[PDB]
Structure 1
């Protein structure tokens, strides 16, 4: 199959204002449904949904990616790697119902951007234009990463998504959000204390906590601290590899730098595989509910 080209196509007649309204609806529901997952809220799962719907991309043939919004098809939403994301999709259902004009890919990705910003993270420029593609364009399961591997695995894995060392380490800071759930992934526990506030806590915890390699109730190894935090073997690999370690230390000591680098890497992740016409609108930077006094 020849390398497909996905050209961004703006939803008919829509502009910044239309998308800010969708952002707002998502942000308002995030505030409303705050009891989810023992009051962590839907922020983390929406970020993970944005990542997993974008992370199926393969730079070699442009298959997968955020463009098609293929997670709406059974093969992909039933991917074992996506266990638990159905909660995020259900959250977005009423949003898509109110704004039926937005594409699935635009909604999934915008959900992640909205969550990060509302959780006090950096502003993440976002571009519209993803177009829904047929069920036969859904990528096969197995493109998302395993968590029981080492640094070499992580480095090699992300090369498929065209991410370098700094981009990988910056992206990983998102694990400051939410937690692992034994029933979903075979891992259990949060990475930090501020589960629904976007900060550089992930890096400080990796470096400052005293970690012990233990077996959880699913008989899988994970690193645990007496504080009640955990790290996946892939997370811990960031301090085992000397190159990753240097970057982890940088972000643990510069919140602004982490925010700026994460913003760039996350937008890149959400845009991989998409060709934006020269005359396409500039990226949108949405105002938070707080900035709008809403």
Structure 2
């Protein structure tokens, strides 16, 4: 099935910058969430999980249809906690009812990365809501207790290569694991609501110990109070991933540029953009607007 991007009727860059801005202003205002981490990280994860159900083989799932709004997908165990990002976006959607669900979930992620002093992420509009029976089944999002071979094979289904995977994983600088949500507990670093390359630096430079958490799952822990999932740690066990990790630990601009590309790609997988669609939008941050 082909999913052709269809611009919300009559809308242009300024309309979407207004949505961006409302998201960004609420991100700033609602700062208490998650022990003052704020909603940035869970909005990035919402964008990823609503996009990451995609299957390149038959174009099922993906960001286009905004299917997270249906109970099979919002109740996926893999999505535990993302209801907080959805609830955040609800007043945004009420103010701007014309935006599609897929466009809002993906734009939430872009806005969060940028407002957290991350790279600019070009973003295209035109996702169209699809019906409840187009919601992908549970089980398409990745397990955390696995090795590099798992990770590499998993991401082939999203048409991501080694560089794209290692870049995307850098988003684990953000937020934290929550025991009651995933069976893992702890942040990955100190700067967890500012977008930086800290994930790679911590992988290489902390002294990690393989411990069991209080849900009886293994994770890697440091004396600084940071953690890595087994799938994170796999990026330094596999020599191909390791090279790339070192590259991003040593070049913040390269990480930003590669993350931006991979994240846009993730958010656009499955969508066909007509030849005469608008160019991708690059939104100004609140700071750049003086707001």
Question: Structure 1 length normalisation: TM-score?
Answer: 0.99
Q: Which residue of 186, 189, 197 corresponds with 1:189?
A: 186
State the Cα deviation string for residues 73-109 of structure 1 (Å, max 9, x = none). 0000000000000000000000000000000000000
Q: CA deviation at 1:257?
A: 0.2
Secondary structure of the corresponding residue to residue 248 of structure 2: helix
Q: How does 1:135-150 map to 2 (within 5 A)?
A: 135-150=132-147
State the Cα deviation string for residues 17-53 of structure 1 (Å, max 9, x = none). 0000000000000000000000000000000000000
Secondary structure of the corresponding residue to residue 209 of structure 2: strand
**Cα distance in structure 1, aligned partners of 2:88 and 2:233:** 31
Q: How does 1:220-239 map to 2 (within 5 A)?
A: 220-239=217-236
**Cα distance in structure 1, aligned partners of 2:144 and 2:177:** 11
State the Cα deviation string for residues 257-289 of structure 1 (Å, max 9, x = none). 000000000000000000000000000000000
Corresponding residue number in structure 2 for 1:164: 161
Secondary structure of the corresponding residue to residue 202 of structure 2: helix
**Cα distance in structure 1, aligned partners of 2:231 and 2:3:** 32
Q: CA deviation at 1:162?
A: 0.1
**Cα distance in structure 2, aligned partners of 1:173 and 1:55:** 16
Q: CA deviation at 1:292?
A: 0.1
Q: CA deviation at 1:63?
A: 0.0
Q: CA deviation at 1:208?
A: 0.1
Q: CA deviation at 1:199?
A: 0.2
What residue ranges of structure 2 are gaps of 5+ in the alignment?
Answer: none
Q: CA deviation at 1:254?
A: 0.1
Corresponding residue number in structure 1 for 2:76: 79
The runs of 4+ residues in structure 1 deviating greater than 3 Å are none
Corresponding residue number in structure 1 for 2:259: 262
**Cα distance in structure 2, aligned partners of 1:182 and 1:169:** 24
Q: CA deviation at 1:60?
A: 0.1
Question: Structure 2 length normalisation: TM-score?
Answer: 1.00
**Cα distance in structure 2, aligned partners of 1:74 and 1:257:** 39
Secondary structure of the corresponding residue to residue 15 of structure 2: helix
Q: CA deviation at 1:133?
A: 0.1
Q: Is it true that 1:25 corresponds to 2:22 in the alignment?
A: yes
